[PDB]
């Protein structure tokens, strides 16, 4: 549904997830929090993670 045949792992998950703390628990928990505050992500919490 995203458009391309992509994966499930740590680069295949970041195609849709604007949720940061969901991405900051899957893998590379350090780099996903430093990158979100740099880009000023809003992160409206609605996911169950």
């Amino acid at each position: 549904y995203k458009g391309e045949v992509l994966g499930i792992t740590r680069f295949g998950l970041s195609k849709m997830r604007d949720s940061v703390l969901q991405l900051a628990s899957f893998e590379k928990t350090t780099d996903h929090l430093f990158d979100a505050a740099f880009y000023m992500k809003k992160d409206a919490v609605e996911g169950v993670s």
Partner: protein
């Protein structure tokens, strides 16, 4: 519509949208000897009109987001000619399901 015969050059498509109402295509005589529509893995694709595009946005209460997206420089999208924001209806056929449908927005 332009049909290449061999490998393209980087300076051909340097100003493709330069005409404001029109454009050109980009093809290749190697990967055009068989069309992908008659292949058994590709189901029937058909483009909806602008009046039929706002009918599924009334039935499913959606907008110009939050739809399963299809992209440009896609072989179905290059065969059919989807410009931007055009809904294509897929009439895909699963085995134990029947003849259900799906809609894709073009980006």
């Amino acid at each position: 519509i332009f049909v290449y015969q061999n490998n393209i050059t980087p300076s051909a498509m340097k100003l493709v949208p330069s005409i404001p109402p029109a454009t050109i295509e980009t093809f290749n005589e190697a990967a055009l000897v068989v069309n992908i529509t008659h292949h058994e893995l590709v189901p029937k694709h058909i483009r909806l009109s602008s009046d039929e595009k706002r009918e599924l946005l009334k039935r499913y209460r959606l907008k110009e987001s939050q739809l399963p997206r299809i992209q440009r420089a896609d072989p179905v999208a290059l065969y059919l000619g989807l410009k931007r924001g055009e809904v294509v209806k897929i009439i895909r056929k699963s085995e134990t399901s029947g003849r259900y449908a799906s809609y894709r927005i073009c980006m």
